[PDB]
């Protein structure tokens, strides 16, 4: 199918700061990926973003009823919808499951990678740190970064490059809004 | 900002596909099944706390369709440039032999929002238990999408997520198999 495609998008956005204390509403129109016109509640009228949007900005701004609807949106739309969904979105907290397992950087070599797999958490904000015998190890640490699973949970793998010695205890420590104190998982060689 | 809630819509020609969804901080709250005219909550629990009149989405999509007509003409019929996806395959949880898990195929950073996705097990298409999301908006106004395959890990099976998109010269296969 080589037929040309044409895409229209609209995004009506509500931005919240300090609960609903400060709210900004953006009404955004796009042709393909190009935003062409927008209403910003900071401004209170539509403004063309590109030349393509100039006719709409002028036409829409001539409609006082439309403008008053948009000017009220921070209250009647944004604050309203925040109230409706906050209990299962804003307040959503799911604590991470934490697993540590050894791995190899190269097949022929002994285990020289410790993986801290942190799974199933919400929201995305998380801090993961490695410790060797109670001392934080900041070198040789690599991660997947924060991965969205698409189902209101996240995961991340945080790897420590190290050559484990007999007796050593490694600890992965996880901090997250769902937790009231750090979650730690130990791994001992062997 | 602490949080963002977006009502995101699109309409695509000539496919005549239109979508309507709400996003909270990058996750889908719900979308509207346009053909069934029903609200589909991303997690079933959401629908016990809130409602949405699906009919209202249809009216917006109709406006978006008419606006697309207008904008296509204004642009002198300039079409979209295909942007092919990045594809990653991962599991939901650490893999243990014969412990139920889920493969996730993450299809990201693409447009237009049309893709064919197939799960392959040992080179053969599999559909039992599969699921998928609608097209999800990105802040750069491209799209992303997730496909899922529950599975029982074994040394005997390999998997691939196969993705077809007009921006790709050939289908993209991303592999998964049990490590060590």
């Amino acid at each position: 199918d080589t037929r040309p495609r044409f895409l229209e998008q609209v995004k009506h956005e509500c931005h919240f700061f300090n609960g609903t204390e400060r709210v900004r509403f953006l009404d955004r129109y796009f042709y393909h990926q190009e935003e062409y016109v927008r209403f910003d509640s900071d401004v209170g009228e539509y403004r063309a973003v590109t030349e393509l949007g100039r006719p709409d900005a002028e036409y829409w701004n001539s409609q006082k009823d439309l403008l008053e609807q948009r000017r009220a949106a921070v209250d009647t739309y944004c604050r309203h919808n925040y109230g409706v969904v906050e209990s299962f979105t804003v307040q959503r907290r799911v604590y991470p499951e934490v697993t540590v397992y050894p791995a190899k950087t190269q097949p022929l070599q002994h285990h020289n990678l410790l993986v801290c797999s942190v799974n199933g958490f919400y929201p995305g904000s998380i801090e993961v740190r490695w410790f060797r015998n109670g001392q934080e190890e900041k070198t040789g640490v690599v991660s997947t970064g924060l991965i969205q699973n698409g189902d209101w949970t996240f995961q991340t793998l945080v790897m420590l490059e190290t050559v484990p010695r007999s007796g050593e205890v490694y600890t992965c420590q996880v901090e997250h809004p769902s937790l009231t104190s750090p979650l730690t998982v130990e791994w001992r060689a062997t | 900002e602490e949080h963002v809630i977006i009502q995101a819509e699109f309409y695509l020609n000539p496919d005549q596909s239109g979508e309507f969804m709400f996003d909270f901080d990058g996750d889908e709250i719900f979308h509207v099944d346009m053909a069934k005219k029903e609200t589909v909550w991303r997690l079933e629990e959401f629908g016990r706390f809130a409602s949405f009149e699906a009919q209202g989405a249809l009216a917006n999509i109709a406006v978006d369709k008419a606006n697309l007509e207008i904008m296509t003409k204004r642009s002198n019929y300039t079409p979209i440039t295909n942007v092919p996806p990045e594809v990653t395959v991962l599991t939901n949880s650490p893999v243990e032999l014969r412990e139920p898990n889920v493969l996730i195929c993450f299809i990201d950073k693409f447009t237009p929002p049309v893709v064919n996705v197939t799960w392959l097990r040992n080179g053969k298409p599999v559909t039992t238990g599969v699921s998928e999301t609608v097209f999800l908006p990105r802040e750069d106004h491209l799209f992303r999408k997730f496909h899922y395959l529950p599975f029982l890990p074994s040394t005997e099976d390999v998997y691939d997520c196969r993705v077809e998109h007009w921006g790709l010269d050939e289908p993209l296969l991303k592999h998964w198999e049990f490590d060590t």
């Binding site: 609209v10 009506h12 009404d27 129109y29 006719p55 709409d56 002028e58 036409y59 829409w60 439309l66 609807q69 949106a73 009647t76 739309y77 309203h80 919808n81 109230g83 409706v84 969904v85 | 009502q7 819509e9 709400f22 709250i29 719900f30 706390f49 809130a50 409602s51 949405f52 009149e53 209202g56 989405a57 009216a59 917006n60 406006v63 978006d64 008419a66 606006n67 207008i70 904008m71």
Partner: peptide
């Protein structure tokens, strides 16, 4: 409680 939509606006023809 009901989520409210924001209408999309017809452009100039």
């Amino acid at each position: 409680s009901a989520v409210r939509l924001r209408s999309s606006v017809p452009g100039v023809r």
